[PDB]
Amino acid sequence: SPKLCLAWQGMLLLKNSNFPSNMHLLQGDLQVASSLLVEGSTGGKVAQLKITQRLRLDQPKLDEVTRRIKVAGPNGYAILLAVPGSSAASDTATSTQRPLRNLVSYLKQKQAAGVISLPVGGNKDKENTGVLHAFPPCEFSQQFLDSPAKALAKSEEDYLVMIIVRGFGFQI
Amino acid sequence: PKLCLAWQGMLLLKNSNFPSNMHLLQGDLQVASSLLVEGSTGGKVAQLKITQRLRLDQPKLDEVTRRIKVAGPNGYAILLAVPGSTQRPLRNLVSYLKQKQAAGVISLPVGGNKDKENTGVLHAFPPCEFSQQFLDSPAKALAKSEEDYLVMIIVRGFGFQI
């Protein structure tokens, strides 16, 4: 049964919009999430995660998401459920706050997963980095939702499934 | 992180069992882990039996609040029970306790203990103004409807736990 630990709270960013979100652990290694959802240089907490790329939801991409989880192994991935969270001129990054449903609807219509490189700011060694793929509700993402998970996921318009994979190849 | 699953099993009332998952809201996880056991062995228990009730009146609720406070930070744990010898959905237990206007009472550990400091009491509250105070916004999302959860308040021992 999914642990549902509150692994992260903050804003997802896409260009000039931000979306408050709470992320709950569904499966995999909580430590994979806690070690990558950070500022890369310090390991410190980050309040924003920026979607910088899109992955198409075509079957060949989905099959590679599945394969990279299996390659990484039980200590090399985490899957989270992202649900809506709780709702200056010199700021180099401006953004309109929007409900998570906006981002969900966008990714559903674009038929894409959002890509977030981790940790924030990167790292020179390929093996201490990772990637989060943010999937909208769809047949692929529903396979990771058991009955207690769906209760959190109120509607097919209000959640994302976040798949974090650490490193390159098998994780030990 | 808050909200991790801390116990999975059946809540027992009379001749019915209600599968429940308990997630940590507040307090000391170790209070729950050490008391949600079979006393004679310290091992995992799959069932917890409600054997008493406490009415939801104001002087009793004020005293629950006081007992949480006096226990200290290692003396209590608060958990959210969500749906997880006839099996019934948890909402039937919720409806029953809502109708009776009472909290269920479970003595811990299962089987008791001769030393008070190694025992606890779990009060299982239905949704109400009092129990809602323990749910922040992230927790409210797990709670779903006002018919589908209980708030489990575990207090260890007697007075401040030190």
Residue numbers in the entry:
A (entry chain A): 7 to 93, 102 to 186
B (entry chain B): 8 to 91, 109 to 186
Wording from the paper:
We solved the crystal structure of RBM15 SPOC (to 1.45 Å resolution), which has a distorted β-barrel fold comparable to previously structurally characterized SPOC domains. The conserved lysine and arginine residues cluster to a basic surface patch similar to that of SHARP SPOC. Although RBM15 SPOC dimers were present in the asymmetric unit, SEC-MALS analysis revealed that RBM15 SPOC forms monomers in solution, which was also the case for other SPOC domains. RBM15 SPOC has a preference for serine-5 phosphorylation but also binds phosphorylated serine-2 and serine-7 with similar affinity. We modeled RBM15 SPOC binding to an 8-mer CTD peptide phosphorylated at serine-5. In the model, phosphorylated serine-5 is tightly coordinated by the conserved residues K795, R834, and K898. Compared to SHARP SPOC, RBM15 SPOC had a clear preference for double phosphorylated CTD peptides and mutation of the highly conserved R834 to alanine reduced, but did not completely abrogate the binding to 2×S5P CTD. This indicates that there might be a second basic patch on the surface of RBM15 SPOC. Indeed, our RBM15 SPOC structure shows a potential second interaction surface at a distance from the conserved basic patch comparable to that between the two patches of PHF3 and DIDO SPOC (patch 2, distance to patch 1: 21 Å). Amino acids R847, R848, and K850 are potential candidates for electrostatic coordination of phosphoserine from the second CTD repeat.
